[PDB]
Design a protein around this nucleic acid. Structure first.
Lengths: 60, 103, 158, 137, 143, 190, 73
RNA sequence: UCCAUUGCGACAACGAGCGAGACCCCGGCCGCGGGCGCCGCGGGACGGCCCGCGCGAGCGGGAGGACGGCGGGGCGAUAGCAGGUCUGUGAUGCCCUCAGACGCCCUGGGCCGCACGCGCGCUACACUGGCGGGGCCAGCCGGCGCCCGCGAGGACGCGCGGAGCCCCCGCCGUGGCCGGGACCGCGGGCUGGAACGCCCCCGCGCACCAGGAAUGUCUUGUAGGCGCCCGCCCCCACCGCG
């Protein structure tokens, strides 16, 4: 319920839906170190600190 | 004697104007001096429709005529009435390069 | 009215000749069509722009922009020396930036110790790079399809 | 010198001084005129003449050896014409008032002629500078 | 200026020339509410009458109000020129006057009558309501 | 330090640190000079605007409508006025207020079209920090603009009010309202 | 629609406006216009009076806008 | 792989050519020379250096540098369209007109007329503003004095010369109001053989509160905003090239 902030460690390309989204791998530096995949809009880069409203969603 | 004469030469192409320059400087070192003044380039501009009828995309021509001018007024008293002739006939006779002499 | 490249400016015949020879240094700034010429010598800290001090330049808000290098480097050097700038070309702001560039470059040339010159370069460029290196971009030409360089005339299909 | 003081305070201070000291006087036609075809209404202050006079004398001092004609001054007091559903265009100011001002100045020897136009005279430099220094404090 | 408080004689709404005028507006822009008076003609009239111009019209004491009337019926005497008037070189008496309300409407009506019986181009056009000057019709100017 | 670039020669820039970590590295505060004016050609690379001092980023957004394009000195003046007003009301350094607003303003979630299927099929996604700061600035400016139009009050007071309310987290402002709107239309689509 | 006066009708100046303003820390012409529903010019005049008296002081000035601070506390 | 049939590497194909690039003009940095007036000749940048990859061609990042990876323009392949132009011409085939002329020259009128549908533009809908006063800087390039007149303009006489936005101080105070300036009524001038044309002054003071279904253009000195010159021209620019 409480949003958590994740870090980026790998970007794996855009989508074909007009090329606005970018798939991104992140890791919970809070201690869990879970390497998952999400969908992000806008310019991203390594070591960015995303903010997540869900601790249990996926993408692919 | 001394007649404050001035040399003006005009041309549309930049390659002879510089060649004429060198010949004159070569041939006027003795009869005094002859250092040049390079003027701002007078560029004539004409814009025209590329079409004789006015059809299709409005497309334009851009012509121009650059005119280059150099001015040796360095003779001055260093040239007499006949002395100006000497060099002016010893310099090459390039087909096109207007020249006028005035005191 | 003024043209920047005029011989009457680059040599600064404005100054009288016996005084024209006391000025050792020479310097240049520019931005767009603006050009500034500085004649630096030895004195006790005085600066002038078109026969006007630095405190009374006209846009008012940018006075800090022209005083920048002083409060950066420090007033010791400038207090040591005295300057007389003259600028001519398009625009108030362009003139401002050209002037500050000339200030900085000239004070750089006053020092003879190259090592200090390099140290000052590092000290100053870090804060900004256009204080030494001229900005290159310049106004670009227009085309006949419309009333702008890249904009076009509106097209009506039906 | 005069250029070492901001133009704003000099102009108005000197105008007050001029008006006190009877050097110039506003003629009669001032009561109902604009200062240019570009304008639209008349000035709101009653002492605009002396402001113009001071700005002019300052202009003449700045130039120095050079010479200024009347119209050349009038191109420094131009503006923009609006209200014509047509693109705006710049227009020149008036010349009768400028002419009156220079004539009044010249009758006092503050201003001297030449081959063309007029230019400042040494007395003008004296008074302008002394007033400027006086207000420097 | 420096008039903060309403003077004891403040008059909240003025009536003059059958028109009504408010006392919160500055004087020279309120008179513009009359038909025949504008900005240029007003500044000139008041000034000759020794009246302040940057004043709210409600502080206009009747003593200053009457002298103003005396200057709008005989203005030429009071020094005002003749290029500043509404009606220069009248068609009949050849004189010059300034015409205020009521006079304008009557005057405008009689010219058209003059135009009509004389059989001009303008008169015939006025009566079908067309452009009088040469400004082009046809294009634009449609519902 | 030796030269503390006090902004407008009044309020310093030494104790101003963002709280949120996510967007901290996308807010420059150590470099501001004394004037929000710098002819630098930012926006040439893909991430260089991340260095532009935030106040300059704000001013560049106050001259947007075509009536007001190319007018930066007016904007600098406007910002100075607003900052005086803020320090007057709140009592504290305005720059902190501004960063706090740009933080609390800015969405954390958004919806886009990727699911196709012949309909909206929108998918909830996450939002990058740079976009967050850009949107926060844009919303501040836009909300101030909409208030001052055909209203007696001036642009600067509207600006200050919007900044203060957004920094307080209050939903009276336009920025917070837009943030909430986007968040709900998204979470609905998650 | 709304109308506001340009001249204060006598006791109105002091029975409120002077009182009201004196209990304000910061102020501007437009705020006071919108607050007690009078035009801006009167605000200008009044604030002139007050800075003359001394209650308020200038912190920022400009043709488009100046703002005051209450020095009475 | 490349913006590119731009290249690598193969193959019943081998070997060539055009187009593309190269090339020409402009600009930015440095040098030499000359110099009434800034203008003539050259150097400089090449995916060259470092790091990653890739057999290879080549891709991503960092430098140092005036400039970093097609900076803006010109030229523009084969083949073709029943595209436009016989009203640009001593360019023209076949027709029609050819002494009451469709030849040529004169006087007037018209091409502009207006219940209506739409295409490119201009001006505004206001306080991020309008009015009044003052200060100040451009470039393609460039002409001025004195005296009358409110002004627009005019009489004389000589060769000399640059603005809007913006900035500072004040007034107005959300009112179709001092926003906007169409229409109309008296008057003064310019061009010209000739005003129906164009400028200036006083008064009157139309629509218009950011615009439905629909739709156009744009990536750095760019959009947008602000003005200034030439062309056609007796006078006149909301157009066009810059």
């Amino acid at each position: 319920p409480e949003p958590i902030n994740a870090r980026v460690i790998e970007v794996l390309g855009r989508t074909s839906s007009r090329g606005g989204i970018t798939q991104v791998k992140v890791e919970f530096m809070t201690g869990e170190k879970r390497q998952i995949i999400r969908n992000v809009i806008g310019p991203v880069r390594k070591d960015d600190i995303l903010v997540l409203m869900e601790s249990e969603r996926e993408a692919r | 004697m001394h007649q404050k004469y001035t040399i003006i030469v005009v041309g549309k192409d930049l390659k002879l104007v510089e060649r004429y320059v060198k010949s004159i400087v070569k041939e006027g070192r003795a009869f005094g001096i002859s250092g040049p003044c390079r003027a701002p380039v007078r560029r004539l501009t004409i814009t025209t429709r590329k079409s004789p009828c006015g059809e299709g995309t409005n497309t334009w021509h851009r012509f121009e005529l650059r005119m280059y001018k150099r001015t040796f007024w360095v003779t001055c008293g260093g040239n007499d009435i006949s002395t100006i002739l000497s060099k002016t006939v010893v310099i090459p006779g390039i087909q096109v390069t207007v020249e006028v002499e005035e005191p | 009215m003024a043209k920047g490249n005029r011989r009457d400016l680059l040599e600064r015949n404005d100054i009288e000749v016996r005084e024209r020879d006391k000025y050792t240094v020479h310097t240049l700034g520019k931005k767009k069509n603006s050009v500034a010429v500085a004649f630096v010598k030895a004195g006790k800290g005085d600066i002038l722009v078109n026969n006007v001090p630095l405190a009374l330049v006209r846009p008012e808000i940018l006075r800090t922009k022209v005083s920048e290098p002083i409060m950066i480097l420090g007033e010791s050097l400038f207090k040591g020396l005295d300057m007389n700038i003259k600028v001519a070309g398009g625009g108030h702001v362009s003139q401002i930036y050209a002037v500050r560039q000339a200030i900085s470059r000239g004070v750089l040339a006053s020092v003879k110790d190259e090592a200090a010159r390099s140290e000052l370069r590092a000290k100053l460029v870090s804060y900004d790079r256009q204080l030494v290196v001229s900005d290159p971009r310049r106004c670009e030409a227009k085309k006949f399809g419309g009333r702008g360089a890249r904009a076009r005339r509106q097209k009506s299909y039906r | 010198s005069v250029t070492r003081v901001p133009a704003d305070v000099f102009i108005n201070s000197f105008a007050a001084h001029l008006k006190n000291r009877g050097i110039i006087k506003c003629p009669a036609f001032t009561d109902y005129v604009k200062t240019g075809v570009s304008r639209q209404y008349a000035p709101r202050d009653a002492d605009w003449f002396y402001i113009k006079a001071a700005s002019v004398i300052r202009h003449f001092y700045i130039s120095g050896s050079h010479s200024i004609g009347v119209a050349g001054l009038a191109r420094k007091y131009s503006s923009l014409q609006k209200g014509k559903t047509t693109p705006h265009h710049t227009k020149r100011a008036s010349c009768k008032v400028i002419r009156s001002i220079v004539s009044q100045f010249l009758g006092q020897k503050l201003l001297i002629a030449g081959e063309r136009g007029r230019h400042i005279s040494p007395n003008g430099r004296k008074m302008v500078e002394d007033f400027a220094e006086g207000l420097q404090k | 200026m420096t008039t903060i408080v309403q003077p004891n004689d403040y008059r909240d709404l003025l009536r003059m020339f059958n028109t009504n005028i408010q006392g919160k507006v500055v004087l020279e822009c309120a008179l513009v509410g009359i038909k025949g008076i504008g900005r240029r003609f007003a500044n000139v009239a008041l000034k000759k009458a020794n009246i302040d111009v940057h004043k709210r019209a409600g502080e206009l004491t009747a003593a200053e109000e009457d002298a103003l009337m005396k200057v709008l019926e005989d203005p030429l005497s009071h020094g005002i020129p003749a290029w500043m008037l509404n009606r220069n070189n009248d068609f009949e008496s050849g004189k010059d006057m300034h015409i205020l309300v009521n006079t304008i409407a009557s005057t405008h009506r009689a010219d058209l009558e003059r135009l009509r019986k004389t059989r001009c181009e303008r008169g015939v056009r006025h009566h079908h309501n067309l452009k009088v000057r040469g400004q082009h019709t046809k294009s634009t100017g449609r519902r | 330090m030796s030269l503390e670039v006090a902004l407008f020669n009044k309020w310093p820039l030494t104790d101003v640190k963002c709280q949120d970590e996510s967007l901290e590295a996308y807010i420059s505060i150590d470099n501001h000079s004394f004037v929000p004016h710098s002819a630098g050609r930012w926006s040439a690379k893909r991430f260089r605007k991340a260095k532009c001092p935030v106040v300059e980023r704000l001013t560049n957004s106050l001259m947007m409508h075509g009536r007001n394009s190319g007018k930066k000195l007016m904007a600098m003046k406007t910002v100075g006025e607003a900052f005086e007003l803020i320090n007057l009301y709140t009592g504290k350094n305005p720059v902190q207020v501004l960063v706090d607003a740009v933080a609390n303003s800015g969405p954390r979630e958004d919806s886009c079209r990727i699911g196709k299927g012949g309909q909206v099929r929108r998918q909830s996604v996450d939002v990058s920090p740079l976009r967050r700061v850009n949107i926060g600035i844009y919303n501040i400016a836009t909300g101030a603009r909409k208030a001052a139009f055909r209203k007696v009050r001036p642009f600067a007071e509207c600006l200050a009010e919007e900044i203060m309310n957004a920094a307080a987290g209050a939903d009276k402002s336009y920025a917070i309202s837009q943030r909430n709107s986007v968040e709900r239309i998204a979470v609905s689509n998650r | 629609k709304v109308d506001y006066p340009t001249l204060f009708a006598d006791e109105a100046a002091m029975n409120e406006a002077l009182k009201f303003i004196k209990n304000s820390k910061c102020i501007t012409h437009t705020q006071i216009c919108e607050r007690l529903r009078v035009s801006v010019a009167l605000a200008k005049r009044v604030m002139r009076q007050l800075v003359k008296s001394g209650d308020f002081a200038i912190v920022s000035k400009s043709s488009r806008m100046t703002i005051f601070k209450n020095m009475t506390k």
